[PDB]
Ligand binder design. Structure first.
Ligand SMILES: *[C@@H]1O[C@H](CO)[C@@H](O)[C@H](O)[C@H]1NC(C)=O
Ligand SMILES: [Cl-]
Ligand SMILES: [Cl-]
Ligand SMILES: [Cl-]
Ligand SMILES: [Cl-]
Ligand SMILES: [Cl-]
Length: 173
């Protein structure tokens, strides 16, 4: 007999978690299943409950998580892997911005360490995210708003810097 459809695995309030802040991971499949199994891939340790409450985020809790449920003798396909990120592990980078060509805006996420990954975002609902393997990013048709940037290493991509101080982009003439 074949497996069941995958559950979802979600971090609330967010999967981007500052060190020392709370996060809850929740596995959710169909109503009435018999067992949920939630694991962390780095340790291959697991708990047989759908909910994991982390009162205060730690570096060692960052990384990929996955869950499956069982019903009868049958297992589900596993969830998409949740990528739990610890922020604030390293000093914050410095974010600057300049007009580019046309409506392009150049954002620079500058650091002292030798980082090779950078995530930039504009506050809002929804948030606009940009990610790059180099510290200069061109945002095409950039929107006005509040931007911040994180730096990290591709060798452990789940441990991020503190976010940069905000920069305010005013596109309106
Ligand atoms: C779980 O198994 C029971 C029968 O043992 C069945 O009634 C129910 O619909 C199953 N649930 C899912 C989500 O497949
Ligand atoms: Cl199925
Ligand atoms: Cl969920
Ligand atoms: Cl955030
Ligand atoms: Cl630290
Ligand atoms: Cl540019």
């Amino acid at each position: 007999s074949g497996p069941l459809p995958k559950p979802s695995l979600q971090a609330l309030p967010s999967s981007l978690v500052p060190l020392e802040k709370p996060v809850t991971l929740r596995c959710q499949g169909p109503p009435g299943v018999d067992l949920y199994r939630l694991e962390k891939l780095s340790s291959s340790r697991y708990q047989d409950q759908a909910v994991l409450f982390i009162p205060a985020m730690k570096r060692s809790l960052a990384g990929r998580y996955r869950c499956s449920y069982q019903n009868g003798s049958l297992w589900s396909l596993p969830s998409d892997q949740l990528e739990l990120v610890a922020t604030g592990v390293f000093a914050k980078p410095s974010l600057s911005a300049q007009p580019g060509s046309g409506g392009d805006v150049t954002l620079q996420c500058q650091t002292r360490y030798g980082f090779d990954q950078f995530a930039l975002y504009k506050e809002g609902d929804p948030e606009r995210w940009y990610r790059a393997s180099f510290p200069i990013i061109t945002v095409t048709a950039a929107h006005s708003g509040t931007y911040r940037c994180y730096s990290f290493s591709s060798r452990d991509p789940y441990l991020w810097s503190a976010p940069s101080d905000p920069l305010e982009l005013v596109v309106t003439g």
